[PDB]
Structure formats: C-alpha cells, structure tokens
Amino acid sequence: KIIHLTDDSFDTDVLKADGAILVDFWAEWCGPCKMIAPILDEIADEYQGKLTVAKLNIDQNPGTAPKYGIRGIPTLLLFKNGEVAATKVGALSKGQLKEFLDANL
Amino acid sequence: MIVSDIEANALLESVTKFHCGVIYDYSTAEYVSYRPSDFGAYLDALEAEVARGGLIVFHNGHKYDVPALTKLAKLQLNREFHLPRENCIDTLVLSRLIHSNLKDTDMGLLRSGKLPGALEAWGYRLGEMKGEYKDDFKRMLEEQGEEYVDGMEWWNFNEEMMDYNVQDVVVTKALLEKLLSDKHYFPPEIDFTDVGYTTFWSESLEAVDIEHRAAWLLAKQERNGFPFDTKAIEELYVELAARRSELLRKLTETFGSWYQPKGGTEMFCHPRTGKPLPKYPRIKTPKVGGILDTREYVAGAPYTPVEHVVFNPSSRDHIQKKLQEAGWVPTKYTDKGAPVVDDEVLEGVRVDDPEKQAAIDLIKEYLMIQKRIGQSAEGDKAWLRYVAEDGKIHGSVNPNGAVTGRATHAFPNLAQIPGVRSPYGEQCRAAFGAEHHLDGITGKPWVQAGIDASGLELRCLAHFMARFDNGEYAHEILNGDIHTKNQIAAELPTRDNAKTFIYGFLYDEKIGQIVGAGKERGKELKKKFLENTPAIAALRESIQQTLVEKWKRRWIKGLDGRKVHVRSPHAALNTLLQSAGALICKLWIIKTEEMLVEKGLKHGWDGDFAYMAWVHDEIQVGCRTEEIAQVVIETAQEAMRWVGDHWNFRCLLDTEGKMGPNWAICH
DNA sequence: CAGTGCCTA
DNA sequence: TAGGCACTGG
Ligand SMILES: Nc1ncnc2c1ncn2[C@H]1CC[C@@H](COP(=O)(O)OP(=O)(O)OP(=O)(O)O)O1
Ligand SMILES: [Mg+2]
Ligand SMILES: [Mg+2]
Ligand SMILES: [Mg+2]
CATH class of the missing domain: 1.10.150.20 (5' to 3' exonuclease, C-terminal subdomain)
Structure with a gap:
C-alpha cells in the first residue's frame, strides 16, 4: 500500500492530498534506507486509513529533495494538508516510528 | 677572477635599493663586505676587475645582479654602470649546462618537492637562500613579540642579510670550482680561476661560451617583454565567459543534479551479522535525539549524510557518470581504475538519446572554452595576471631547461599560446604583438618580424x-x-x-x-x-x-661538444636530432642579434629592435620601422647560413620570415 | 599532492 | 615520441 512518487506527481499526491502523508526520501545505495524500508511496509499496512506512506527515490527523481534541503537519508517528512508538520532523519525502528506517528498524527 | 653577489630590496622589475654586496677576490683570497653606504665602492671594485681584463662570477647574475646593478647605479648614484657580457660568468648558467640532466628550482620560484630527480646541493642552497633568510627573520621577529608582514625581510639592510650575502659567495665559489673541475668542459691543464676573460672563453668548450651568450641575450628578451593587448583579452574573456555560462545552462538542464554520500564518519555494519560493509557509504549515528522533541535525529538511528551536486562540465568524473548512465560502455581505462574521458573518446561516444548525444558536443566546446579562459584570464599563470605596467608580459625563460639543450618557458609559458588554426587562436595570437607597443618618442606602433627555421x-x-x-x-x-x-x-x-x-x-x-x-x-x-x-x-x-x-656511454656529443644525456635507447635518435635543432637555433639567435648590432642597430625599446620571444626555432622581433623589420628578416637568414657553415652542416639550413603587426600574422 | 588531459615546438 | 599548466577530488 506504499505510494511510489515521482518528481512530476509529488505536488498532487503529497502537497494537494488530504490527510497525513509520510514521505520517505531514499536511495538504493544507502544502508540505513535499506534498513527502514521493511519497517515502512509494515507501517503502511498497520496505519491504513489513518496515514499514507509514500516513497521518493532521489536518484530517479532528483528535483524534489533539494527543495526540502535534504542533508541525510533516509529522510522521513510528514505532510499535513500541504505542508511539513514533522521531520525525522535516520533508520528509526518500528517502535520509534510508531511513536513518531502516533504522537504527530 | 672575483666571485660576487648582492642583496637588494626587490625583484629586478621594482628594485630601488642596493642593501649590500660581497666580493671574493682570487688574487687576494679575501672576502670583502660592502654595506649600503659602500655602493659606490662596490661598483668601483667590479669595474676594476673589468679594467684588468678579468672575470666576475655571479650565481644567476645574468638575469638579476648585472641588470639590477645597472638599474641601481642610475637611480642611487646617477651613475652609468654596464658590465660587459664577456667579463661575466654565471654559475647557474654553468650548472644548467653541466648538469643538464637535473632540474632546479629556478632560484626558489619552484617548490623543490615537486621537482623530479635529484638536485645539485650547492645550487639548491643558493636557490633556497631567500626562503631561509625569510624564516630566520620571522622567527627572530616573533621571538621579540613583533608581528611579521609579508616581504618585510627585504625592506631594510641588516647584519643577518649581510651574513647571508657572504654565505652566497662562499657557496657560489664552491659551486664554481666544482663546475670548473669537469674536465669535459674545462681542460685540466688550465687553472680557469687564474686567467683573463679572453682565455676563459677560448680555452673552455664552445658550449660554455654559447650558453652564456644565450643567457645574456634571453635575459634582455625577458626585460623587453612581449607587448600585449590587455583590452582585447578582457573583451575576449567577457565573450568566453558568457558562452561558458550559456553552455553550463544548457548542460545543467540536460544533466540534472544528484546526491552523493558525504561527511559519514562511521562504517556501515550489517544490523544482524555485524559484518563490516566497506563498500557501503559511511554513516553517522546520532547520539542525541528522541520522539515533543522537534529535532530531526534519534539516538541510535543511523543515516547516511549526503551532499547535493550540480553537473560540472569540467569534471571528468561527472561526464563519465552521466554518459554511462546514458548507455555508454567505455573501452579504454586509465592505469588506475578509471574510464578515459578525453576529447578523442568523447568524439567516439554514441548513445541513444539524441539530446544527450548532442550534449557531448557542448561538453567538448565547454572544456575547450575553459582551456582558453584558464590560460588567458583565470588560471594562476593567466596572461591578464601577468601583464605589467609597461603593457607587456615578461615571460621567464630557462635557456637550457630541456635535457636536449632546448630552452623552457614559464610565468607564463609563451611557448604554448594557442595556434592560429585552433579555436580562438587568432584572437589569442593577435593579442601578442609589436603593434601593441607605441614608440616612446613618436607614439607610433612598432612592427613585427617573425622568423622560423625551415x-x-x-x-x-x-x-x-x-x-x-x-x-x-x-x-x-x-x-x-x-x-x-x-x-x-x-x-x-x-x-x-x-x-x-x-x-x-x-x-x-x-x-x-x-x-x-x-x-x-x-x-x-x-x-x-x-x-x-x-x-x-x-x-x-x-x-x-x-x-x-x-x-x-649514456650521453651523446652535441654540436658544440657538450654531453647530451640520453634517457632511453629508444629516444636516442630524437635526442640527437632535437639537440642539434636546439643548438642550431641557439647559436642562430645569438648570431642574429650580434649581426644586427654590428650593423649599427640598437637593442631595446629605446632603440631599433627588441627580441620579444624565442619559441624553439622561431623568433618574434619587435621593430621600430618596416625597414628595420626587413633588415631583421634578411639578417636572420644570413645568421642561419653562418651557423650551418660554422658547424660544417651537411644540409643547407634556411629560415622563413614574415612581417606584420602581431603574432597572428607572423607565424 | 596526485591523476588527467590539453597547449606548444 | 621536449616542456608548462589547469581543474577536480581527496
Ligand atoms: N610533434 C612534434 N614532435 C616532435 N618534435 C617536434 C614536433 N613538432 C615540432 N617538432 C620539432 C622538430 C621541428 C622543430 C620546430 O618545429 P616546426 O614545426 O617549426 O618545425 P618544421 O620543420 O616541422 O616546420 P617548418 O618548416 O614549417 O618551420 O620542433
Ligand atoms: Mg641572488
Ligand atoms: Mg622548423
Ligand atoms: Mg617553429
């Protein structure tokens, strides 16, 4: 149930969407990214209807990330009705992630 | 014979004060020091040696001490002082001949660590004297809680400077006798420290005389400088810069930016095995942070620090990254794990996307435009950075910098200006010209005579x-x-x-x-x-x-008898021919100037002609009038015929001359 | 500072 | 198959 974004769809899928959307900026060559990926798949299913999990591979879609000043990956950006509400960088555990979501949702 | 050296306040171009000087006289075997108020006496002593038909030895005196003294005598004492070329010996000129197989620092202008091979000890010390004196000065200042200002060690005379002056003469004397002990260049039966100048030149190997005449003449060429069209190069710069910008705009639209790992300190380890993963980008593990905590990090939650990088057309790495991505599969790599990315391979690279394929041409145009900008304006050795107040570029020349006997050019290298047939070469070449020098009396531009050995x-x-x-x-x-x-x-x-x-x-x-x-x-x-x-x-x-x-035997005998080091059996023929060419050209430019002078022409901007450049087998000469330019061209041809006869050459030698306003037209 | 690549003859 | 020098990346 993960939404795979692209530079051209990001605006309407994330910024113009309704409800909370968690965006994961990642790269295939990042160890930490590969670590949290599995966790994100589980969150997506667990938080159905209460949250939307999206992913943007910065190598295939190079235009978006810079606009948000990315300096490290994975970068978890939470958008609420068009804007960033919270942000966390690094390979959080499922537990740490659930906390981040619950507390922020 | 006397050995001498002087200490002054600045480089030749701006020297205004004689600080001190030291003279070692072989006939008395004593060292004499001359302090600032002794300048007049210092000069008297030098001219006395000249009156005896004697010899004066300086280390690099042909380019500095001798010219400097003429200049300082006029400014400080309103005196006319001109040491004759035939009375002067230069141990740097000598070392460059005898140890032609070794590099040198060019009197401290080059960092010794960067030079390949060994360095002759005495000459090394002489070349490092300024830097050592500076180090002593600084530490001595800081020792007195005083601050140091760049180059202040040269503003005033002091006994420390005096002591270095004496040391230079002691080392120079030792260098000299070491050079004089080379029996191939100086007959063992003659004590060359005890003969008149006439004997010194006639009894030593011809190469010795030839190199000194070459250094004397080229030192003059450096002082003349090459008239340079500053305004034209600045306008060229503006044009090249805009085209550079436009090419960058097009290329950064075709090849978008990307992210690269950067700043990672720790090694990424498999979260289950512990197995270190060297290949993976280095990560960073935050120590502080938690889930309300507004910070974006969480202790123990590792991430890969990265950086945003824009396509840099000057980067071979960036070029290579985008082209392979576009389907390019390199064929030739560097003996260091890296795909060759030079103009030749770029010309052969084929990809499917027509836009990227066309961008290859923009990349080649961009690299080239950068080569011109770098050489003409932005590089450390850029022309615009070297043009002096007199409107000329005074490039340096090591008369015997190449092993074969050829000379080397630097600061900037006037033997590597883009040719007229290459992109922008006509503008580059045209900027260097006699026409850019206005006669000191009539204000009229001079004319250029370019002669090349055929x-x-x-x-x-x-x-x-x-x-x-x-x-x-x-x-x-x-x-x-x-x-x-x-x-x-x-x-x-x-x-x-x-x-x-x-x-x-x-x-x-x-x-x-x-x-x-x-x-x-x-x-x-x-x-x-x-x-x-x-x-x-x-x-x-x-x-x-x-x-x-x-x-x-690892050397070949040059046309004037010197030893010409052979690096490899395969380069032997080349060594033999390039040396012959170099030596022919060297005696040629010497004879050409000597003939013009015997014809009554004066060498200088205040005269009739001025050597502006010598690029292996061509000379570019600035001439006050067209008629003089014609005389220079015809005289150069006669000097060449003279050289061919001088060494009984088995092939007739010739020259080709062109008269024009600048280098674009004269070559 | 080293690896590459271009400028000249 | 003699040299100088610029630009990138560590
Ligand atoms: N690419 C090269 N490789 C080796 N030596 C060269 C090279 N180019 C020139 N030289 C040497 C041999 C000739 C000498 C002077 O260069 P130049 O090109 O003027 O000689 P040239 O005799 O070929 O031409 P010209 O007859 O037109 O003066 O420098
Ligand atoms: Mg000196
Ligand atoms: Mg030729
Ligand atoms: Mg030539």
Whole structure:
C-alpha cells in the first residue's frame, strides 16, 4: 500500500492530498534506507486509513529533495494538508516510528 | 677572477635599493663586505676587475645582479654602470649546462618537492637562500613579540642579510670550482680561476661560451617583454565567459543534479551479522535525539549524510557518470581504475538519446572554452595576471631547461599560446604583438618580424644520414617544401598534420591516430616512409651501437661538444636530432642579434629592435620601422647560413620570415 | 599532492 | 615520441 512518487506527481499526491502523508526520501545505495524500508511496509499496512506512506527515490527523481534541503537519508517528512508538520532523519525502528506517528498524527 | 653577489630590496622589475654586496677576490683570497653606504665602492671594485681584463662570477647574475646593478647605479648614484657580457660568468648558467640532466628550482620560484630527480646541493642552497633568510627573520621577529608582514625581510639592510650575502659567495665559489673541475668542459691543464676573460672563453668548450651568450641575450628578451593587448583579452574573456555560462545552462538542464554520500564518519555494519560493509557509504549515528522533541535525529538511528551536486562540465568524473548512465560502455581505462574521458573518446561516444548525444558536443566546446579562459584570464599563470605596467608580459625563460639543450618557458609559458588554426587562436595570437607597443618618442606602433627555421629537424636528419647516403636526403630536401611534399604522399589533411606525422614517425597506432586512421594505415605509412629512406635505419643502428652494449656511454656529443644525456635507447635518435635543432637555433639567435648590432642597430625599446620571444626555432622581433623589420628578416637568414657553415652542416639550413603587426600574422 | 588531459615546438 | 599548466577530488 506504499505510494511510489515521482518528481512530476509529488505536488498532487503529497502537497494537494488530504490527510497525513509520510514521505520517505531514499536511495538504493544507502544502508540505513535499506534498513527502514521493511519497517515502512509494515507501517503502511498497520496505519491504513489513518496515514499514507509514500516513497521518493532521489536518484530517479532528483528535483524534489533539494527543495526540502535534504542533508541525510533516509529522510522521513510528514505532510499535513500541504505542508511539513514533522521531520525525522535516520533508520528509526518500528517502535520509534510508531511513536513518531502516533504522537504527530 | 672575483666571485660576487648582492642583496637588494626587490625583484629586478621594482628594485630601488642596493642593501649590500660581497666580493671574493682570487688574487687576494679575501672576502670583502660592502654595506649600503659602500655602493659606490662596490661598483668601483667590479669595474676594476673589468679594467684588468678579468672575470666576475655571479650565481644567476645574468638575469638579476648585472641588470639590477645597472638599474641601481642610475637611480642611487646617477651613475652609468654596464658590465660587459664577456667579463661575466654565471654559475647557474654553468650548472644548467653541466648538469643538464637535473632540474632546479629556478632560484626558489619552484617548490623543490615537486621537482623530479635529484638536485645539485650547492645550487639548491643558493636557490633556497631567500626562503631561509625569510624564516630566520620571522622567527627572530616573533621571538621579540613583533608581528611579521609579508616581504618585510627585504625592506631594510641588516647584519643577518649581510651574513647571508657572504654565505652566497662562499657557496657560489664552491659551486664554481666544482663546475670548473669537469674536465669535459674545462681542460685540466688550465687553472680557469687564474686567467683573463679572453682565455676563459677560448680555452673552455664552445658550449660554455654559447650558453652564456644565450643567457645574456634571453635575459634582455625577458626585460623587453612581449607587448600585449590587455583590452582585447578582457573583451575576449567577457565573450568566453558568457558562452561558458550559456553552455553550463544548457548542460545543467540536460544533466540534472544528484546526491552523493558525504561527511559519514562511521562504517556501515550489517544490523544482524555485524559484518563490516566497506563498500557501503559511511554513516553517522546520532547520539542525541528522541520522539515533543522537534529535532530531526534519534539516538541510535543511523543515516547516511549526503551532499547535493550540480553537473560540472569540467569534471571528468561527472561526464563519465552521466554518459554511462546514458548507455555508454567505455573501452579504454586509465592505469588506475578509471574510464578515459578525453576529447578523442568523447568524439567516439554514441548513445541513444539524441539530446544527450548532442550534449557531448557542448561538453567538448565547454572544456575547450575553459582551456582558453584558464590560460588567458583565470588560471594562476593567466596572461591578464601577468601583464605589467609597461603593457607587456615578461615571460621567464630557462635557456637550457630541456635535457636536449632546448630552452623552457614559464610565468607564463609563451611557448604554448594557442595556434592560429585552433579555436580562438587568432584572437589569442593577435593579442601578442609589436603593434601593441607605441614608440616612446613618436607614439607610433612598432612592427613585427617573425622568423622560423625551415624543416629544421628534417634537415638535421639529412645532415646525420649524409655519411650513410652521401647527401641524397639533404639534396632531396632542398627540392621544394619537404612538409608539403610529405602531406601529398601521406595524403594528409594539413601541412601541420604532415609535420606531426613525419616527426612522430621519425622518432603504428599513434601514427594512425595522428593521421586519422587505425594501426593498419599507421603501419603501411610507417613502412612506405621508411622504405623510402633506408639510411634512417643505419643511423639508428650506429647510434645504438655507440650507446648500448647496460650502457657503454649514456650521453651523446652535441654540436658544440657538450654531453647530451640520453634517457632511453629508444629516444636516442630524437635526442640527437632535437639537440642539434636546439643548438642550431641557439647559436642562430645569438648570431642574429650580434649581426644586427654590428650593423649599427640598437637593442631595446629605446632603440631599433627588441627580441620579444624565442619559441624553439622561431623568433618574434619587435621593430621600430618596416625597414628595420626587413633588415631583421634578411639578417636572420644570413645568421642561419653562418651557423650551418660554422658547424660544417651537411644540409643547407634556411629560415622563413614574415612581417606584420602581431603574432597572428607572423607565424 | 596526485591523476588527467590539453597547449606548444 | 621536449616542456608548462589547469581543474577536480581527496
Ligand atoms: N610533434 C612534434 N614532435 C616532435 N618534435 C617536434 C614536433 N613538432 C615540432 N617538432 C620539432 C622538430 C621541428 C622543430 C620546430 O618545429 P616546426 O614545426 O617549426 O618545425 P618544421 O620543420 O616541422 O616546420 P617548418 O618548416 O614549417 O618551420 O620542433
Ligand atoms: Mg641572488
Ligand atoms: Mg622548423
Ligand atoms: Mg617553429
């Protein structure tokens, strides 16, 4: 149930969407990214209807990330009705992630 | 014979004060120090040695001490002081001749760590004296809680400077006697520290006399400088910069930016195995942070620090990254794990996307535009950075910087200005010209005389094979232009391509590449040309047999008798011909100037002509009038014929002269 | 400071 | 198959 974004769809899928959307900026060559990926798949299913999990591979879609000043990956950006509400960088555990979501949702 | 050295407040261009000087006199064996108020006496002593028909030894005195003293005598004492060329010896000039196989720092201008090979000890010390004196000065200041200002060690005379002056003469004396002990250049039966100047030049090897005349003349060439069109180069810069910007705009739209790992400190380890993962980008593990905590990090939650990078057309790494992504599969790599990315391979790179394929051409245009901007304006050695107040560029010349006897040029290198046939070469070349110098009296621009030795090394080849073919080649050469005659046969595009061919050949793939074909054509041409001239093999053999046997002798005897170091058995023929060419040209420019002077012409901007540049076998001479330019051209041809006769050359030597306003028109 | 690549003859 | 020098990346 993960939404795979692209530079051209990001605006309407994330910024113009309704409800909370968690965006994961990642790269295939990042160890930490590969670590949290599995966790994100589980969150997506667990938080159905209460949250939307999206992913943007910065190598295939190079235009978006810079606009948000990315300096490290994975970068978890939470958008609420068009804007960033919270942000966390690094390979959080499922537990740490659930906390981040619950507390922020 | 006396040995001397001086300490002054600045480089020749802006020197205004004589601080001190030291003289060692062989006839008394004593050292005499001269302090600032002793300047008059210092000069008197030098002219006294000249009155005795004596000799004056300086280390690098031809480019500095001698010119500096003429300048300082006029400014400080309103005195006319001009040491005759024939009374001066230069141990740097000597070392560069005897130890032609070694590099030097060019008196501290070059960092010794960067130079390859060993360095002669005495000359090394002499070249490092300024830097050492500076270090002493600084520490001595900081020792007194005083601050140091760059170059203040040279503003005033002090006993520390005095002591270094004495040390320079002691070391120079030692260097001198070490050079004089080389029996190949100086007959052991003569004590050269105890003879008059006339004897010194006539009894020592010809090379000794030739190198001193060359250094004296080239030192003059440096002071003349090459008139330079500053305004034209600034306008060129503006044009190149805008095109650079436009190419960058187009390229950064075609090849978007990306992210790269950067700043990672820790090693990424498999979260389950613990297995270190060296290949993976380095990560960073935050120590502080938690889930309300507004911070974006969480202790123990690792992430890969990265950086945003924009496509840099000057980066071979970036070029290589985008082209492979576009489907390019390199064929040739560097002997260090990296795909070769030069203009030649770029020209052959094919990809599917038409826009990216077309961008390859923009990349090549961009690299080239950068080469011109760098050389003309932005590089550390850029022309715009070197033009002096007099409106000229005074490039330096090491008269004997190459092992073969050729000279080297730097600061900036005026022997590497883009040719007229290359992109923007006409503007570059046109900026260097006699027309850019306005006569000091009439305000009228000077005119340029450019003379180039014709088919020089092919004629040197003819000379050396004459004892194998009795002069057939030398004779065949003076039957039209050899290079044009080559181009035709080789079916080559340009007369330059024919030159680069014949010289690559004389000294299969490389041949084919230069000719534009493959190893097959290179081979065919290599044979068709060798079979045409078989005596070339005999000359090679004879050379090999004389040097190799593990060396039998690792040097070849140059036209003036000096030893010419041979680096490898394969480069032997080239060494022999390039040295012959270099030495022919060297005596040639010396004789040309001597003849102009015997004709009553004055050398200088305040005279009739001025040597502006010497690029191996061509000279560019600034002339006050067209008539003088004509005399310079005809005289250069006569000097060449004189050189050919002087060394009994087996092939007639010639020159080609052109009169014009600048280098674009005179070469 | 080293690896590459271009400028000249 | 003699040299100088610029630009990138560590
Ligand atoms: N690519 C090269 N490789 C080796 N030596 C070269 C090369 N180009 C030139 N030389 C040497 C041999 C000739 C000498 C002077 O250069 P130049 O090109 O003027 O000689 P040239 O005799 O070919 O031409 P010209 O007859 O037009 O003066 O420098
Ligand atoms: Mg000195
Ligand atoms: Mg020539
Ligand atoms: Mg030439």
